[PDB]
Amino acid sequence: GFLPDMRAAASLDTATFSTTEMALALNRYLCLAVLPLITKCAPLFAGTEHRAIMVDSMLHTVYRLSRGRSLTKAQRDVIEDCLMALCRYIRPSMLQHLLRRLVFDVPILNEFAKMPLKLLTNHYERCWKYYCLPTGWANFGVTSEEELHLTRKLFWGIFDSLAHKKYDQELYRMAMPCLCAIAGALPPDYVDASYSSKAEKNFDPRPVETLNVIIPEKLDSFINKFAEYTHEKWAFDKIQNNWSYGENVDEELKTHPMLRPYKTFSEKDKEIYRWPIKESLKAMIAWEWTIEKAREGEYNPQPPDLSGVTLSRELQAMAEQLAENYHNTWGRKKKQELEAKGGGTHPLLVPYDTLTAKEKARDREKAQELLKFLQMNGYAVTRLDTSSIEKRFAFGFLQQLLRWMDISQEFIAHLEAVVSSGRVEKSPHEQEIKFFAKILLPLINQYFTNHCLYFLSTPAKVLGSGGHASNKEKEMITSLFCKLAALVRHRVSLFGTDAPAVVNCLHILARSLDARTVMKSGPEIVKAGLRSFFESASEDIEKMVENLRQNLTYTTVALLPVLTTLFQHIAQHQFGDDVILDDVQVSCYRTLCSIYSLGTTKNTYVEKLRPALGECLARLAAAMPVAFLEPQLNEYNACSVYTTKSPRERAILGLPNSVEEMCPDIPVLDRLMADIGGLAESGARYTEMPHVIEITLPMLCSYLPRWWERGPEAPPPALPAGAPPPCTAVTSDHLNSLLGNILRIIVNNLGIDEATWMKRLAVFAQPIVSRARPELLHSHFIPTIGRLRKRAGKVVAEEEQLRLEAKAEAEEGELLVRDEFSVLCRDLYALYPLLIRYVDNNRAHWLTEPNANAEELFRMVGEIFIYWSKSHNFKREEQNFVVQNEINNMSFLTADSKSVQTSLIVATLKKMLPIGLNMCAPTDQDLIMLAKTRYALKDTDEEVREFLQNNLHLQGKVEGSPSLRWQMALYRGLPGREEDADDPEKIVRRVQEVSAVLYHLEQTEHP
Amino acid sequence: QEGFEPFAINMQRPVTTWFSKSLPQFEPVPPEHPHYEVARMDGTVDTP
């Protein structure tokens, strides 16, 4: 019904019938009736492997009709939409032929190449895992290395075509998604079978015109001999199939009709069969490789040509090229036949590369048969050496990117020249600038984003999209890191719109980088460049401190995020133990001294910038392996400069041979924590000392936790190594003091509304809230959370007073208490993560041995929860606080690490819920049930307390049922459990509390 | 404290279990076997 229809349409599509009335009628009928039907049937096309050939045929002919001219734009759109909708469900195992045709038709990048690349990028987004993952995509076959080779050629061709063509906004804008999709889909460690490019010029198989030139007489006798050998190997194969050479002409004999022994085989048809071999060997001599004549001289041929096996690299490559010669000759004659027909196309007419395997198998069989016959009588060809490491797609793309960076330096130098000499907008190379700004940064960004773990992987740590980036690949991508670093360092004022992309690309270059291999036996040039970049950053921070007492739009805007991100990357790969061991930490000393010096100044600029400076110093402290608060303990540490340099070498490197006066601005950590404790006891605020919370607390909380492992408390695996005073001498007591000081500054700054920095004050408290002493609960958490509960109760009382009076001034006061609710919700979100981690640590201890203090904390935090449930205004203030301050992400992070109202229901109730149910007897569950029912009957707390007092006989007994007998047995077997809780007042108190908690929990889950 | 009963708590005798014993033993043809089929044609003339 259908396939003949658009086949006839394609036949009528020719120029002679382009304007035919019936042809237009056919196109109209198809586009209005048949093609929409195909769109509707597109979902049903899944799993059509058994009709693969005809599905491929319909795809190809739909593409041909889409390119078919004499169509209205609406009809064009109908065909395009039908093709893309069908492709959305067509499996690539039938689609590879259409994909290769689109790959060879897209390089034009105009006319009928825009929608094609759109279809390609849609399919690549659909099958991104199919092409990149070495394992076959789930329920689909594994992608073919030939398909990856095709995508590689497509990538390079489209890239060079975009580079060559003039900058068109539409073209670049809609071509960048496809190019990025190809780059992401193609794995980096994939190596092509032939690490070269066709660079040629319905495919046109240009034949080999070698038939004009005769085969040289140095091998012509050989060529005739091989022709005889082929026509005799026909008989050989037949007789291996039990069919000897037959001398009779008839169709029943499956051998050659005139197939006789060469003694009796007439030579009249021997020339006829000889001519094709003449043409074959003329084709192969037409190239740069020629077979050698080490032999002498030159119906069953005993030596067989084992064409199925492999051989040497270049020889098998030229055999493949000779198969390509066969294919191009056959394709040219079939193309003459096709132009005689005037319609349709030949699927076999595709280039000898992206062929079907079956005719690839046939051409390979013929060529390798020829090659083996060459081999067994000594015929090897006489006329690069690229390792797979260089053949890698990542390696090739990095080569291209080096060439583009030298181009970048060139055109930015020209831009600097023209901006210094007035203004010259007209540039003979502005195409390069636009190409960069539109594709190169986005393309490299997407590529390193989707292969970040690949480049980050090492030969030892095999991981990522590929196995691992090569060592040379790692060192050259580090070189590119330094390259982009200098690129943004100089002429930063230019490409201001491109600056966010530049800084993001530099950040991801900092990521996906193995600096250990760069340090160890790496490129000394790249190492010197990165050390010089560190010194440049240090002197730029020095210029910043002197100025605050363009770099304004580069250091703060670009640098500080860049080296900050590099710092936490180095920290979380622990590169610092090697990368910052020597020649880098000295620059780190200078930077930290400069930051602590600028902290003394109270300029507005430094006060508004000190958050990011504190973050950067914390990251570098986490990434630096030497003691800066411990000058005396430092010389023991091996990463210190002094243990690696003699006094003279320290003098020549600028080291003054003493850590104390090399970093005199920051004193010893003992004096530092004494000062922090003194300030906490004095009880002042962020405004009073902005420097402390922004610098010293990042410093203190980045030194103590991660250097506790280096401290004596962490058991040293090596007793000889631990025998000398360790690099760090602090203990869990010191970390406890740090946590105490942080909580003191918190309990101070509950009151003020300007404490916006609670975000970090909790983020950094998260690493240190671990290893918390049990006494911390009663010493700090109980008073602080009690004060919070008192303040919340006062605010709820104010809310009730405002609610009981209906007045516009009452609503104005309601808005004021909304603001108060919002600020106390900021405080609540600051305090809750610490309590969450504390209870997650000490809950096992509380479950094993119950604590009355823990139960009291449970009761009062449940009171906080019930005020939350009662006050709807409190919930909406939490809502708007979270949405404006972006605390939803930090709530999620707190939940996953340990709606936006989940924080209170998970901390107040679900954290201590086992604690709450532990202290109540199993026999009290009946009282709990009846109390929850009486709550569901909407009665108040005092009234249900009276009901519990009335129901003293409603509680069950252990003898009543074996189901609760074991519960009672375990509950009394709890070591902390006694019979004192059996007092009726205690029973009714605990039952009412737990039942109210459960009542409010179930109301929250379902009103 | 989560309401989850231990399994086989009220068992007096020890719970009997079963192990996958690896010993080749012949078993009849499954008529629903996805790959093999057995037919039973008999009574044909001049063929047993």
Give yes or no for a contact between A896 and A836, defined as CB atoms under 8 angstroms apart.
no
3-state secondary structure of A191: strand
Query: Which residues, other chains included, contact A307 with Cβ-Cβ below 8 Å and sequence gap of 6+?
Result: A364, A365, A366, A367, A368, A369, A371, A372
Q: Tell me the C-alpha distance between A165 and A158, whole Å.
A: 10
Work out the number of other CB atoms within 10 angstroms of the CB of residue A241.
Answer: 10
A966 contacts B1? CB cut-off 8 A? no
CA distance B1 to chain A (A): 6
- Retrieve residue B28's tokens: 């009849």
Count A/B contacts: CB-CB distance under 8 Å. 6
* Chain A: residue whose CA lies nearest to B4: A967
Which residue, A562, A679, A573, A687, is CA-closest to A622? Answer: A573
Q: Which residues of A touch B7 (CB under 8 A)?
A: none
How far from B8 is each of B5, B14, B16, CA to CA, in Å? 9, 9, 11
Is the CB of B1 less than 8 angstroms away from the CB of A962?
no
* Nearest residue on chain B to A912, alpha-carbon basis: B1
Smallest Cα distance from A996 to chain B, Å:
18
Determine the distance in angstroms separating the CA of A914 from the nearest CA of chain B, rounded to an integer.
Answer: 6
Q: Which residue of B has its CA nearest to A910?
A: B2
Write the secondary structure of A562-585 as one string of H (helix), E (strand) and C (coil).
HHHHHHHHHHHCCCHHHHCCCCCH
CA-to-CA distance for A87 and A63, rounded, in angstroms? 11
Vertex A772 angle, CA A770 and A776, to 5°: 145
**Is the CB of residue A304 less than 8 Å from the CB of residue A236?**
yes
Strands A381-382 and A290-291: antiparallel
* Residue in chain B lying closest to A971 (CA): B1
Q: Which residues contact A810 (CB under 8 A, 6 or more apart)?
A: A802, A803
Mutate which of B1, B5, B9, B12 to disrupt the A interface (most A C-beta within 10 Å)? B1
* Distance separating alpha carbons of residues A843 and A288, to the nearest angstrom: 79
Token pair of A162 as six digits: 């975009």
Resolution (angstroms) equals: 4.6
| Those residues with Cβ within 8 angstroms of residue A877's Cβ, 6 or more apart along the chain or in another chain | A818, A821, A822, A825
Distance (Å, rounded) from C-alpha A229 to C-alpha A250?
23
Distance from CA of A971 to the nearest CA of B (A): 10
Report the residue from B1, B9, B10 with minimal CB separation from A918. B1
The three-state secondary structure class of A906 is helix
Residues after which a C–N gap over 2.5 Å breaks chain B: none
Q: Say whether A914 and B1 touch across the interface (CB within 8 A).
A: yes
Nearest CA in chain A to B9: A966
| β-strand partners of A290 | A382
A-chain residues near B1 (CB < 8 A): 847, 914, 917-918
- Looking at the DSSP assignment, which residues form a beta bridge with residue A291? A381
Contacts of B10 in chain A (CB under 8 A): 962
Which residue in B has a C-alpha nearest to residue A962's C-alpha? B10
In chain B, what residues touch A929 (CB-CB under 8 Å)?
none
Contact A917 B1 (CB under 8 A): yes
CB-based contact B9 A917, cutoff 8 Å:
no
Q: Kindly compute the dihedral angle of the four CA atoms of residues A962, A963, A968, A971, in this order, to the nearest 10 degrees.
A: 140
* Test the B interface: residue of A966, A970, A994 with most B CBs within 10 Å: A966
What's A123-171 look like in SS3?
HHHHCHHHHHCCCCCCCCCCCCHHHHHHHHHHHHHHHHHHHHCCCCHHH
Q: Give dist(CA A108, CA A99) in Å, integer.
A: 15
A contacts of B9 (beta carbons < 8 Å): 966
* Cα separation values, A693 from A612, A680, A744, A823, A885, Å: 12, 11, 12, 20, 20
Which CB contacts under 8 angstroms, 24+ apart, belong to A258-263?
A259/A234, A259/A235, A259/A299, A260/A299, A261/A299, A262/A228, A262/A232, A262/A299
DSSP B30: P
Experimental method, per PDB record = cryo-EM
Minimal CA separation from A836 to chain B, in Å: 20
- Scanning B1-48 for CB atoms below 8 A from A yields 1, 9-10
User: Quick one: how far is CA B4 from the chain centroid?
Assistant: 32
